[PDB]
């Protein structure tokens, strides 16, 4: 807290959807103590062995003969660190990995797979610290979530349909910050996915609701978009002090 | 930040500038010097630009488009095709080749835009380099009319012939390593 | 819109991206205040 540098305290762009922008202490700890967003989840950790076995089965020749070769072998498959080889086809590998994430065979919902098309690296991180959030999945310009899923969830009790079934269906997906860097998001399905003057026609995901970017204390603020930003921080601090 | 941009020059203000003044720091964050012009140069923009050029530090790196080192066995050989003409001209009445000539050639090529912005002259640059380094560095300069501004630098003629050194016949820093050292020194320290 | 301009008024209500950018600006102001206190206090003590 003693350090007066105003760099580590500032609200970074990558905090979007994973740490509350409003809720921070004021004083020596401005921007150094943070609070999770409402829908944020933190990876618990998993064994990388099944992912490595799948990669070995698909291709990912390791101990190759200087095959990167100006990255002619597109992408180098990384895991939690540990360059484990490279593949010639990166896009088929990425699509197969996403399908496996849906079927939940080798990739738990928390396994994070990032391909950097330029610089040609795929990272595949499962390291127990990553903070991720649920995002709906957009195929073409249509949300995968449909009326069947919403009707079953509406009957949630005595229908034995839950959020985990929504994840298993492939409707929603957990995305961490590194994957948020490689994903085209829509705030709302209707306003953004639908055809208009085309800003983007390659949305890959959709926010479940924008208001989930706030935390617990900032979620009680009514009409928070109509207040000045420091006032929402003040209200978070004061709502931690209300009597009830 | 939020300082009004009257001019394109940043200035420390507020608490940090008060700290600098109060501490009498030897190194200001933004040391600046306001210069007022005495004569008609204040009124006329071209003379003011001349003063600005005279007051602004300019290294050879700032006006150099690209530098190369070619091993040229003979001056007449002209390994680079382009210099074949002007080298010939300079070797129609060769000067300082009596001792010897260096087998290595530093063929610096200057950007015309930077040269004309700083209003530098090929003779000016050549004089600075040759005089400051001495007779060791011999420079051949192109005409400004030529499309490429080329300065051909060679190591000491007497040092190449080794009659002047006498002592022991042992290469010091070879020649190409010495030429690279010279190139770095010119790039960062010419102060044209 | 991409780089932070908020065209909506407070009464109209900020859109979500504008909301996050506004939060970034307010955070910078708060950090400035908090950092300012200590440096100014040290200067004042030295002068006195």
């Amino acid at each position: 807290r003693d350090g007066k540098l105003a760099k580590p305290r500032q609200l970074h762009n990558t905090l979007w959807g994973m740490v509350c922008p409003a809720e921070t202490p004021e004083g020596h700890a401005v921007g150094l103590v943070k609070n999770l967003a409402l829908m944020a989840y933190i990876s618990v950790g998993s064994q990388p062995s099944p992912i490595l076995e799948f990669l070995e089965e698909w291709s990912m020749e390791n101990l190759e003969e200087i095959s990167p070769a100006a990255i002619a072998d597109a992408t180098k498959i990384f895991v939690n660190g540990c360059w484990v080889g490279i593949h010639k086809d990166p896009e088929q590998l990425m699509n197969t990995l996403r399908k496996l994430r849906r079927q939940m065979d080798i990739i738990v919902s928390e396994v994070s797979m990032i391909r950097d098309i330029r610089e040609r690296e795929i990272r595949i991180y499962t390291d127990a610290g990553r903070i991720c959030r649920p995002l709906l999945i957009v195929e073409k310009q249509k949300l995968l979530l449909k009326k069947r899923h919403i009707d079953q969830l509406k009957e949630r009790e005595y229908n034995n349909y839950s959020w985990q079934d929504l994840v298993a269906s492939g409707v929603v997906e957990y995305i961490d910050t590194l994957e948020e860097e490689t994903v085209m998001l829509a705030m709302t399905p209707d306003d953004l996915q639908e055809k208009e003057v085309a800003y983007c026609s390659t949305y890959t995901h959709c926010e479940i609701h924008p208001s989930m970017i706030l935390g617990v204390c900032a979620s009680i603020i009514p009409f928070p978009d109509h207040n000045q930003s420091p006032r929402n921080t003040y209200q978070s601090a004061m709502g931690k002090q209300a009597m009830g | 930040f939020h300082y009004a941009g009257v001019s394109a020059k940043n200035v420390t203000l507020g608490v940090p500038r008060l700290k600098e003044l109060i501490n009498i720091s030897k190194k200001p964050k933004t040391p600046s010097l306001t210069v007022f012009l005495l004569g008609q140069s204040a009124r006329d923009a071209e003379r003011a630009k001349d003063i600005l050029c005279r007051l602004e530090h300019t290294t050879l790196r700032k006006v150099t488009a690209n530098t190369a080192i070619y091993y040229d066995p003979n001056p007449q050989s002209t390994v680079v095709a382009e210099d074949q003409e002007w080298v010939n001209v300079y070797y129609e009445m060769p000067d300082f080749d009596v001792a010897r000539i260096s087998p290595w050639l530093l063929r610096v090529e200057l950007d015309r835009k930077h040269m004309t912005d700083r209003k530098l002259t090929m003779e000016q640059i050549a004089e600075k380099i040759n005089a400051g380094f001495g007779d060791d560095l011999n420079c051949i300069f192109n005409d400004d009319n030529a499309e490429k501004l080329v300065l051909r630098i060679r190591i000491m003629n007497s040092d190449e012939n080794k009659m002047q050194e006498e002592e022991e016949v042992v290469d010091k820093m070879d020649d190409d390593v010495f030429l690279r050292c010279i190139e770095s020194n010119m790039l960062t320290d010419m102060t044209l | 819109e991409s780089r932070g301009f908020v065209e909506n008024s407070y009464l109209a209500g900020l859109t979500p991206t504008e909301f996050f950018f506004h939060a970034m600006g307010g955070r910078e102001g708060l950090i400035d205040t908090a950092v300012k206190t200590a440096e100014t206090g040290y200067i004042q003590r030295r002068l006195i």
């Binding site: - | 939020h2 | 600006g25 307010g26 910078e28 102001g29 400035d32």
Partner: peptide
């Protein structure tokens, strides 16, 4: 939060 010349 206003502009570049104002406040954040």
């Amino acid at each position: 939060i206003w502009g570049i010349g104002c406040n954040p």
